[PDB]
Copies of this chain bind each other. A is one copy, B any other.
Amino acid sequence: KCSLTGKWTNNLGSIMTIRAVNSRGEFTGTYLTAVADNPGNITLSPLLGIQHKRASQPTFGFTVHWNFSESTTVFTGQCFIDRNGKEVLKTMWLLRSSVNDISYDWKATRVGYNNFTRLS
């Protein structure tokens, strides 16, 4: 089994902590990004998500509410286990910027990927 609970780092150097996953697969956590539009502003930021509970290699999603900008990121992915019991989170994300009005909506969404492994 592949619980999200724990500490994780990604390929950019970001650090994420996921707390207890409840019986509905819901979880809270924190996220310290290594990169940002204005990296001097970075602070620890909250996340909230849901994973599938029963699956051995569950899919999941979470939202990061950045505390230092008007942006939001969502991540979705799957937790995989090796033959050796090593876990990897393979994810993709959408990063939504705040724009002034609906005419700028077209430019407000960035896309990318991240792989996470456990810190311990």
Contact = CB atoms under 8 A, between A and B. Distances in A.
A18 interface: no
Given A48-B26, A65-B25, A109-B112, A71 B59 contact: yes
Contacts of A63: 48-50, 60-63, 74, 76
30 contacts: A24-B65, A35-B103, A48-B63, A50-B64, A50-B65, A52-B65, A52-B70, A52-B98, A55-B70, A58-B70, A60-B72, A61-B65, A62-B74, A73-B76, A74-B74, A74-B75, A76-B94, A76-B109, A77-B96, A78-B99, A78-B108, A80-B101, A90-B102, A92-B94, A92-B112, A106-B112, A107-B110, A109-B112, A110-B111, A111-B111
